[PDB]
Amino acid sequence: KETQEASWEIFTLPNLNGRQVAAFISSLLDDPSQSANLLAEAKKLNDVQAFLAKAKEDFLKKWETPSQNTAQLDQFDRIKTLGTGSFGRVMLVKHKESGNHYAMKILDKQKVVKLKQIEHTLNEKRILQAVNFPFLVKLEFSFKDNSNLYMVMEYVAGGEMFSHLRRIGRFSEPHARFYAAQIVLTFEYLHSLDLIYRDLKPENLLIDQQGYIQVTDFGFAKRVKGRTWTLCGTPEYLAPEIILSKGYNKAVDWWALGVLIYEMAAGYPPFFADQPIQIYEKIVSGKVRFPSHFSSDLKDLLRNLLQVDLTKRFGNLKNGVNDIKNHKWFATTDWIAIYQRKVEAPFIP
Amino acid sequence: SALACSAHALNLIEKRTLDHEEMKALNREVIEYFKEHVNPGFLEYRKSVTAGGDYGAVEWQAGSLNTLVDTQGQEFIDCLGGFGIFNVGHRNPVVVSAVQNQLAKQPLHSQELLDPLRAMLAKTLAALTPGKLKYSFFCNSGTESVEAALKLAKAYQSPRGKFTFIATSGAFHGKSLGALSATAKSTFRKPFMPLLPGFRHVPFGNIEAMRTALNECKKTGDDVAAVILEPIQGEGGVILPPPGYLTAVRKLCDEFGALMILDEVQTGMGRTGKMFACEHENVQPDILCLAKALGGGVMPIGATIATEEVFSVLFDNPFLHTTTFGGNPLACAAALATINVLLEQNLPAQAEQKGDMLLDGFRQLAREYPDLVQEARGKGMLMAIEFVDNEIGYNFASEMFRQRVLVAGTLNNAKTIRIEPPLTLTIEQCELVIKAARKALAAMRQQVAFYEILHLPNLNEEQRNAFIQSLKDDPSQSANLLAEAKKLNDAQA
Amino acid sequence: SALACSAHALNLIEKRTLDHEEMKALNREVIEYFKEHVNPGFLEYRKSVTAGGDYGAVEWQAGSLNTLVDTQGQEFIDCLGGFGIFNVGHRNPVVVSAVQNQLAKQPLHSQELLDPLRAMLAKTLAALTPGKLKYSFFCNSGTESVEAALKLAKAYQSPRGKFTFIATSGAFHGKSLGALSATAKSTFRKPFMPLLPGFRHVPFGNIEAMRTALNECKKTGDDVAAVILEPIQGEGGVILPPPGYLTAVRKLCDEFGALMILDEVQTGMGRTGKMFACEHENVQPDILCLAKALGGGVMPIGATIATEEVFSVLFDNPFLHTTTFGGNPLACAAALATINVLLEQNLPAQAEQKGDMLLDGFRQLAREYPDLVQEARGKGMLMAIEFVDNEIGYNFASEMFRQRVLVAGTLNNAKTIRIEPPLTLTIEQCELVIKAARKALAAMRQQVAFYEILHLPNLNEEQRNAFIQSLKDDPSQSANLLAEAKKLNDAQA
């Protein structure tokens, strides 16, 4: 009976399907000892998916009719000029009403049109405007005038992961576990809104004042329902399907995670050659032999994520995201606490 | 201080709406007090707390005629009607103003000066009641009703050497020691025994039996003073007696010179189709007990109407049986209002068409789920569904509670549930109810089936999982997948 | 038709004043109906018709807090207070609006959802009651009060093998069969016997007696379940027990493990000076019965408060003792209003100063007419004058009725009259009363003397006529002329 109580509670979860519940019932039937732990997990899962419901509804609302001119230029005071690109330049600004600091991106309308970047710009903005997740850069304001476009971004001090990875050389697996876990949750979120990210690389990973991650480039991300073909991205992180020129989907993101983890734990990418065409060869017939210091569990996950057989790839099975969340390498990670930001950062810049 | 507690409750009466934390506040005191000053048990066995939610469902105010709204704003359809109280609905505008008028003039009487409304009610009731029932006595409840009836019969019959009283098994008549001597359930009686000497029970609906009781008593010199019964056993589970019974009891009484007492406490005031249930067989008792719905859900009241021959006992010493609050003006008000409404919008006639559309509606549901329901039954707007288990029954009563449809049954006594919505239930709310009970019956069948799939011993986990999968994905197949699992479990048997 | 009779009474509720023939009309129906549907006896024995006048004194509406106005417009001072009902006066504005508020929200409860006012009252009463009295049960009257008390004691004590109940001679506790087993007057009990087995009466105020009852019962294996008594016998004629009695009963109970039940139905709610009479000797009972004035003369109500040790019986099966209307919201309202008023304007304290000024006022009158009054007695605003005859008594109660001062007593039971005016009686109305009783006592003494002069046999007509002459010309000499006539009748003896 005591077990039967926890059984019903698992089945009463509306957010959970037949497959999910039947999985918590089995474990209960087989382990009436972990009854409380099995019912607990069931509740996390339910709750967890439920929120994704509120996340999508909230996304579409903004995705459908997007915000425009949420601020104007004479609401800020130029402090310093942080950086310059081809689009224009980024300045540190102070919001006169609050005294808050942002990194405003000025991009010359006419310079964009030349660089043939009209779509990327529009798509990046429309995505950023609609998105909401802790590990993503937050577009606070957005506007334009006669001469240029303005994207007012939450300023976060701390370099790229690329340059930082050069400094340390390689991260200890607990360090890489902390970064992976964030990219995972980020990807869960984005996939939910039917968005491929398509541009995961250390360069697109900024580090929080809090030492957590912020994901920073969206020129490539697509709201894809079925399959797409545009190839964009860095050779090392392309899934074989991209190269091979057969349609792809959100699976591609999960491949890149694999590559990203490998690099953080090894100090170099798994498929690497002097010249690219060659990097593709090595990717397609996907033989990836690990370093010696690589944990067998970490090896098991990488063998799963880096899998040319996209019907055999972790991320796109029936349990989807949960497969690598429940993997042996991620037993020591508290996902919801990672989410809250209540986990001790391994490094603060 | 008591001064403190009085004021806080006094200001809350004045408040008409609540902030969500003003709500939270309330519900936690009310649970707290119920545990420490009322009964902790009502928190254990009642469906308002078991299925309460995060908070219990504390009452707040009436919605429409048929609806009730708790402290959270959740609106409930009353298919309980306070167990036969709310016959003209909650706060029936015609009753509420008759009360509020009378409240402006004089709420209670002095007990020395001829109070006019007690004449008017005594008169009206004389008019409204079949045959030679002429005099009304007025008390406060259904139990005080029966008690006075017992007292009338007694004072009448004891000079004639008759002391025994036949009542019927399953009969409910009141919880006060006198009525509890005629009330029949074991549970209700045992702790307080010894009760009144000389009360003997016979089976209900059995005229062959009651002859033998009346005759055995005759032979042994213990002749029967009076026979007391309800037209339908209400609490007794909506037991309908065989056609002709009430008429045949009436002769049997007349044959042995025994007074006939009719407890129309729960079937009075138009619930069964007629103004009084004893009109379906056109039977006139010597005494008639009324209450509940006589007070239009506004006031508490009980009336005892009797023939002149019988009520004469009280004539020579009118103080022999008094009560302090009986027949007070504003209770009187309420009844005349209720009696007026019932004859005006002619609600006994409504009771019969809504009472058959509903009940049929239930015995249909009852064919579709014979694995959860033995039977549905009723007569006009008094009806009940009988389940197989108290487990199941409390599960039905509770399930619909959450569907914001308020029905009977408590945690343990719940095998048979009673449906007693106001006679003012709209045809729109009428379906909404049969619909809610259909959803409810589905969900329970799901859960019932769910367990059935699990202890299938010959069935392996691999197969069981496939069923549980399709069960959650398609609760409609709860019957199909079940049959498929049982057929599979027998294949490996 | 009943439809007809309902409407006519319904429109009369609406009417607030009456044309003199609209009056005549009324009073004649009301007498007519009382004779044919209520009781003809109340027309025979009541002072409202005997001394009615051309018409009876049919009630109409409340005057001020202490006054009542009939259908002719005659305003009465209530020194009856509905036999201890109207403690805070008629239509106390604070109670009437608490009721009318609650009437706007929800008059009666559903019986499924935790009703908030029953917690608040249960709480307040816990606060208001001495010692470990914690749980309240709610019913509708004073009789239902005692019945539940008997039931609590029973359910508590029968598992411990104790079934006998001691009550006291002269005790009144209710007219319903259970309470009537403890009520003591012959008249009230005899027709309905046999009542509950195992109730034995002892003399009131006699601790020496009650020991012997409790002990005899012990010896014979009929051990006492509970002892039930009123703090003052109210109806019993305002009998005051000897100082120390209630305290000494309380130990006697504790010694024999018998529950102590206190019937504070007529001495509760501040009438005797304290909120509860059992506070004068600071005695805590196991059970406390309340009613009457708990409903602020607006609502009917009864409360049964008990220790936790005793009320526990109902915890495990909370449905063991229910009532249909008990604790309904708007009755609850009324009490909290009444409880608030009583503590605010601190009316128990008023009860003691008005209660001694009055009573002293009566025992003065009682010295001046020792030929018509044996004694006056009371405790706070519960008091009574004892005359020598029922003849005389009904003559007092009746005389003042015409002086528009409403006191107790009926045609036969009237030897001792009871004075129970509202606790809100002004000092102005306070004299007006003692004044009215002085006029009354004069006029009766006149008539008494008048006859005395006539059967003086030795006295001749010539002399008798001289006395009758000066008697009518000087009613003040009614005592002098009398003595002169008796002295003269003895001269010719």
Numbering used by the authors:
A (entry chain B): 107 to 455
B (entry chain A), C (entry chain A): 9 to 501
Excerpt from the publication:
The fusion helix was designed by superimposing the last three amino acids of the C-terminal helix of ZpA963 with the first turn of the N-terminal helix of PKA_C using a molecular graphics program. The resulting fusion protein could be produced in E. coli and readily crystallized. Binding analysis using gel-filtration chromatography revealed that the fusion proteins formed a stable complex, as intended. The crystal structure demonstrates that the two helices are successfully fused and become a single extended helix without altering the structure of the PKA catalytic domain. Using the calmodulin and PKA domains as model proteins, we demonstrate that the shared helix strategy can be used to increase the effective size of proteins and to enforce four-fold symmetry.
To design amino acid sequences that can stabilize the alpha helical structure of the fusion sites, we superimposed one or two turns of terminal alpha helices of connecting proteins using a molecular graphics program. Then, the amino acid residues important for forming a fused helical structure were chosen from the two natural sequences in the superimposed region. Our method does not require complicated computer calculations for the design process and can be used for the assembly of artificial protein complexes with predictable and rigid structures.
